[model samples]
Target: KTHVQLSLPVLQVRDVLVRGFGDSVEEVLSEARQHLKDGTCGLVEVEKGVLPQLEQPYVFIKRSDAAPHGHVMVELVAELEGIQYGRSGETLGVLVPHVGEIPVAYRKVLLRK
Candidate 1:
């Protein structure tokens, strides 16, 4: 029962796909909090495929004040350990549920990673 450290701050990412556009702002905020701090996965709402339009930055400006406008891409990673995987690491196979990449850990090769 471990939450996936999939919130790797960066510009653009493709590890965990969190659907933060389905409910009230408070709920979504709490949902994001769940992933950002204490949850089992990165706010998984449904089954999705490779974010094809990753190039179409999903900028948000009407969510709340904390996030006035998130135009920059925030990379997400599936880390297995603290700092251990959040940093230098590679992935074998994986999923929102982290179906793979159990040993080396799966992470987003930051735009500058």
Candidate 2:
């Protein structure tokens, strides 16, 4: 039997919250968006899991970069189709579990969609 364990960091921007496997600030912003508001901005960080989970479905945004530190940024989606593949458009045959860390900017601005 084979088991794949995946984990993603939670990021909060104002009332809109998003969780994904992305580590860079750009990746989080790409997945997170705001509704019924303009010129809104906020910060992003690894959630401590103390807050309540968002009711909406989790959006998985793909990236080409290496995984972040502590195996905390593992990416997983409920369905295979849910993944938004990056520009590379490559396929994964095997997943190697690894970990590392990178500095990310917290400041983010929500743009109208």
Candidate 3:
């Protein structure tokens, strides 16, 4: 018998903090601004129940000290399953707001069988 091993580009959401993310646009913007000042800006995973479907996930920006041109890292994560690849990628665009186009990458995970 043979088992198939596959690796596809995927965005995985973990360590969800539902309440931490602000409820409104102003509130989120305020928090985001503060995070930038204090260097606390980081990804906040969405609660599973809040987003059962992964049509479009949230977008969070953080300053990267390592990147050239002081580029900000845009982290996109979701609880997406049983969805087509193109659709998922397209959905992500809706959440992002004029942050410039950046390359998309996937998080690697080791699953025990």
Candidate 4:
């Protein structure tokens, strides 16, 4: 295995209902502040039984070299599969709290793939 290659399969996607993205400035829909942070934002939730379906499989490649953080490089599948795990990227209809926006993550399974 590649030693420097720190593989963190980003296996989950969530929704972010950012309205009025800013609480000011010249950016429209740029005034959003979900009042549930110690002041930051949130993380996503997941489950095995619940999952997603992609039309075409893709391999995600992100440069895990930051202050060590986000700063991704999406590399979709170009060859063939027979890979490992895969996650979902979808949304829902229901609603709840502001924090729930980034917390509605779901559909996790890897038939051992």
Pitting candidate 1 against candidate 2, the one with the higher TM-score is 1
**How does each model score on lDDT?**
0.27, 0.27, 0.29, 0.24
Worst 10 residues of 4 by lDDT: 28-37
Q: Candidate 2 lDDT, tens digit per residue, 9-54?
A: 2233333333232454344334333211222222233245522332
- 10 residues in a row with least lDDT, candidate 3: 85-94
- Stronger candidate by lDDT (2 vs 3): 3
- Please, what's the RMSD in Å of model 1? 14.5
Q: Which candidate has the top score in TM-score?
A: 3
Of 2 and 4, the candidate ranking higher by lDDT: 2
- Badly placed stretches (over 4 Å) of model 4 are 1-52, 66-79, 83-113
A best-first ranking of the candidates according to their TM-score comes to 3, 1, 2, 4
Better structure of 2 and 3 per TM-score:
3
6-109: candidate 4 lDDT, tens digit per residue:
22222233343332123212221111112211222222232443223221122222122222232222211111244423233332111112333433233222
- Tell me how far the alpha carbon of residue 5 in candidate 3 is from the true structure, in angstroms, after superposition: 39
> Model 3, 1-113: lDDT tens per residue?
12112121222233223323354444544554444334333332334453443223233332112222322223222222333222112121212221222224432211111
* Best lDDT among the predictions, by candidate number: 3
Cα error, residue 82 of model 3, in Å, equals: 22
Which parts of model 2 have CA positions greater than 4 angstroms off?
1-14, 17-44, 67-113
Each prediction's RMSD over C-alphas, in Å, is 14.5, 14.4, 15.5, 13.9
List clashing residue pairs in candidate 3: none
